[PDB]
Design a protein around this ligand. Structure first.
Ligand SMILES: [Ca+2]
Ligand SMILES: [Ca+2]
Ligand SMILES: [Ca+2]
Lengths: 144, 25
């Protein structure tokens, strides 16, 4: 079952990538977000990533395609597993922690409309022991 | 990798939502 609220949440995730609001995610829009986070996929790789979600093969992801993928992922994952996978996405180097500076960068770029003050309070709350890193334990409490 | 990156974005956005809702209270 997919609630109205859940669909709206998935639309917010879709719209993060669909920055021109034209109802499709292109390779260019995917590349813009990935480059902003420090990755540099080739155009071929971006095309292959789009193709993992682009069910009708027209070269872009629309919201029915996005929703199919996101709803299936949610049904297939548990609250504990999805937080660990997300941590590993953001712990790109797999070091066991995300530095405060790295987390600030992720939050400003993915939050889009967050002020530096809001990101400040988020980082301060997340970094429980104040050592300038968010480890897995602190990430789980932040995300729970 | 692809699905996980999209789902990770959703999960951090959910964290943003809950943070804002508590700040507004
Ligand atoms: Ca678009
Ligand atoms: Ca399509
Ligand atoms: Ca810490």
């Amino acid at each position: 079952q997919l609630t109205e609220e859940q669909i709206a949440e998935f639309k917010e995730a879709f719209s993060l990538f669909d920055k021109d609001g034209d109802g499709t995610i292109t390779t260019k829009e995917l590349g813009t977000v990935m480059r902003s986070l420090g990755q540099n996929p080739t155009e071929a790789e971006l095309q292959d990533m789009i193709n993992e979600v682009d069910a009708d093969g027209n070269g872009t992801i629309d919201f029915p395609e996005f929703l199919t993928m996101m709803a299936r992922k949610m049904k297939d994952t548990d609250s504990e597993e999805e937080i660990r996978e997300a941590f590993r996405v953001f712990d790109k180097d797999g070091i066991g922690y995300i530095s405060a500076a790295e987390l600030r960068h992720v939050m400003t770029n993915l939050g889009e409309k967050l002020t530096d003050e809001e990101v400040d309070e988020m980082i301060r709350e997340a970094d429980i022991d104040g050592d300038g890193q968010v480890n897995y334990e602190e990430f789980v409490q932040m995300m729970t | 990798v692809t699905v996980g990156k999209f789902y990770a974005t959703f999960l951090i956005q959910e964290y943003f939502r809950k943070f804002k809702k508590r700040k507004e209270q």
